[PDB]
Design a binder for this molecule. Structure first.
Ligand code: HEM
Length: 184
């Protein structure tokens, strides 16, 4: 029902220092629930050290004009391109406003990365059971189109970019300072 996709393959030999740096913007996304049709914008700043990922997350609800901020922490898998995190809720200043709920986690897989582009998959879980998943194309630049390598990776798993929501058209509002100041 809320079962996460199979055939999500972590990139071989991801350059960690490059991927886990700076800010990434979602440019296209595909929620695997066809009824999940609310428009959102997303950006994040993932960092890694000693086999642990610490990331700052930003979402913006286009419909309601409400933004929310989270941080996530968890171990990086031995393959170096997949991690599972627990998360809390913070305000725009980075201060915790709601503690992590033990029953929830998410698993991010980096499927492909090339130049200024990447393709990721996220699986949300409750008590270790799948509750839903999503694919996202990322770019360093809000308005940029994906590298062909990202399209190749989509093709390998029988997805086509035309099915994704494109957010550059949406009235996105970003908190870039929250992400740029992450772990500063
Ligand atoms: C790229 C496109 C993405 C979209 C469109 C999206 C959309 C959403 C939506 C609609 C919600 C629920 C908001 C609500 O209940 O009002 C949500 C929650 C959440 N998402 Fe995303 N998401 C994306 C990517 C990600 C990624 C890549 C991560 C982790 C790296 C992530 C982590 C979370 C977390 C932790 C929550 C729950 C926050 C809370 O309950 O306080 N999301 N997202």
């Amino acid at each position: 029902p809320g079962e996460c996709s199979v055939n999500v393959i972590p990139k071989k030999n991801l350059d960690k220092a490059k991927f886990f740096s700076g800010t990434w913007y979602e440019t296209h996304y595909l929620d695997m629930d066809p009824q999940a049709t609310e428009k959102f914008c997303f950006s994040f700043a993932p960092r890694e050290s000693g086999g642990t990922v610490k990331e700052a997350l930003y979402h913006f609800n286009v419909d309601s004009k409400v933004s929310f901020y989270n941080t996530g922490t968890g171990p990086l898998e031995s393959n170096g391109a997949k991690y599972t995190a627990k998360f809390n809720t913070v305000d725009k200043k980075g201060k915790e406003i709601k503690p992590a709920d033990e029953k929830y986690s998410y698993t991010v897989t980096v499927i492909e990365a090339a130049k200024q582009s990447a393709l990721i998959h996220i699986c949300l879980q409750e008590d270790g059971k799948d509750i839903g998943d999503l694919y996202s194309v990322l770019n360093r630049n809000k308005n940029a189109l994906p590298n062909k390598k990202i399209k190749k990776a989509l093709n390998k798993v029988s997805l086509v970019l035309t099915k994704f929501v494109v957010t550059k058209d949406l009235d996105c509002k970003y908190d870039d300072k929250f992400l740029s100041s992450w772990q500063k």
